[PDB]
Amino acid sequence: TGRDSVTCPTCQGTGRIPRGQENQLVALIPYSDQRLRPR
Amino acid sequence: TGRDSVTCPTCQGTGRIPRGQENQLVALIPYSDQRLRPR
Numbered sequence A, B: 001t002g003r004d005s006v007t008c009p010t011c012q013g014t015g016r017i018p019r020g021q022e023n024q025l026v027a028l029i030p031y032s033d034q035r036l037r038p039r
Ligand SMILES: [Zn+2]
Pocket: A008, A010, A011, A012, A013, A014, A015, B008, B010, B011, B012, B013, B014, B015
């Protein structure tokens, strides 16, 4: 049992949404996830 | 590999959001999920 809540009516509680670059650009870049500190 | 997408910046891709009754009331009610047709 738990509090009352409904699944995301947008992402259907999946965990994936379209970036907002169109509205506001970004200032980041991709990289490689080395073994060191995987978490 | 897959298309580019970011996790829900609201539900953090968890799958739980506050209902919108405050904005718009509802006209539904709870019930029991009998064994017949579980899906
Ligand atoms: Zn979501």
